[PDB]
Design a protein around this ligand. Sequence first.
Ligand code: HEM
Ligand SMILES: C[As](C)(=O)[O-]
Ligand SMILES: [Ca+2]
Ligand SMILES: [Ca+2]
Length: 306
Amino acid sequence: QLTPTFYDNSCPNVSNIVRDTIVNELRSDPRIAASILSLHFEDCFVNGCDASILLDNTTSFRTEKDAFGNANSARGFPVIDRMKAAVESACPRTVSCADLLTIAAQQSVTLAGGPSWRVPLGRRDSLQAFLDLANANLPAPFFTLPQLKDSFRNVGLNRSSDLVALSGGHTFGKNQCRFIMDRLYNFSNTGLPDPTLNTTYLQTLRGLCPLNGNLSALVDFDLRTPTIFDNKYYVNLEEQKGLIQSDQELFSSPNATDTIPLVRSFANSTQTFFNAFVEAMDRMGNITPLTGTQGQIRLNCRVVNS
Ligand code: HEM
Ligand SMILES: C[As](C)(=O)[O-]
Ligand SMILES: [Ca+2]
Ligand SMILES: [Ca+2]
């Protein structure tokens, strides 16, 4: 029952406040738009988009920020706090952190040159965080295509289009050397690099991520347009230049019969990709939301109301 007009009466300027906050942050951190999108994904894949990922530790439950997929990965929490503080100033106790993060993600995509649309709203905030669920539900860069599909299906995204379109979020942002060392020097204990990685690109990546080098070194997901949200991610895949294993599998996996055509279509048309991304983003944002009087309107994203 989520609706795009949910705040048109209670907080008509919420999207503008959010956009303004992101634009300002971009002045000093060009990577923030990508970071925010990642946070929304991490939120929705664990108990749905309920801002559970924003909660800090409490003696009763551990924060999802300590999840293998979020620890020393997720960022931008201070930026979310800032925009939440701004919205709270404009319209007190009105906009949930869950919705706030959803709008922020959409605005981030648009600000990076992606499609523009109004996301459905009306989500409310969880009363707890789910670390174990996060460790079990979040997909990993070393996942095979069947595992990626299972991961998505497990949270309610049954369509291959959901996986291929949303994976396009990697059209911008950074990844650590840590997650590709296997593809570069010892893939699946074969003692060789991943055969699905373009050999010329392999040399470049090896130069950025030498054996015994800094594993925390950041590398661009998209070698074509690192900070621009476009369909270049898919063009890379067609050339065997996906950065992480999970990226390239969409095009090269023996189980990719249903994903290859989508990859090609998105690489072939920017419009086709943008439509599917919007479609998939809203589906992901529709995963088990708390609505009505369920949950609360958290005043501080970091802790439950007291
Ligand atoms: C399909 C499975 C996916 C896997 C295996 C995966 C894996 C990863 C990994 C390993 C990182 C690097 C984290 C770090 O180095 O700290 C990352 C970052 C990121 N992911 Fe994904 N991801 C997936 C899906 C998604 C989805 C669905 C979205 C959004 C629609 C997304 C958006 C991002 C963005 C924007 C970044 C860059 C964040 C930044 O630069 O701060 N990812 N992802
Ligand atoms: C919860 As759904 C992606 O089937 O609308
Ligand atoms: Ca969540
Ligand atoms: Ca790009």
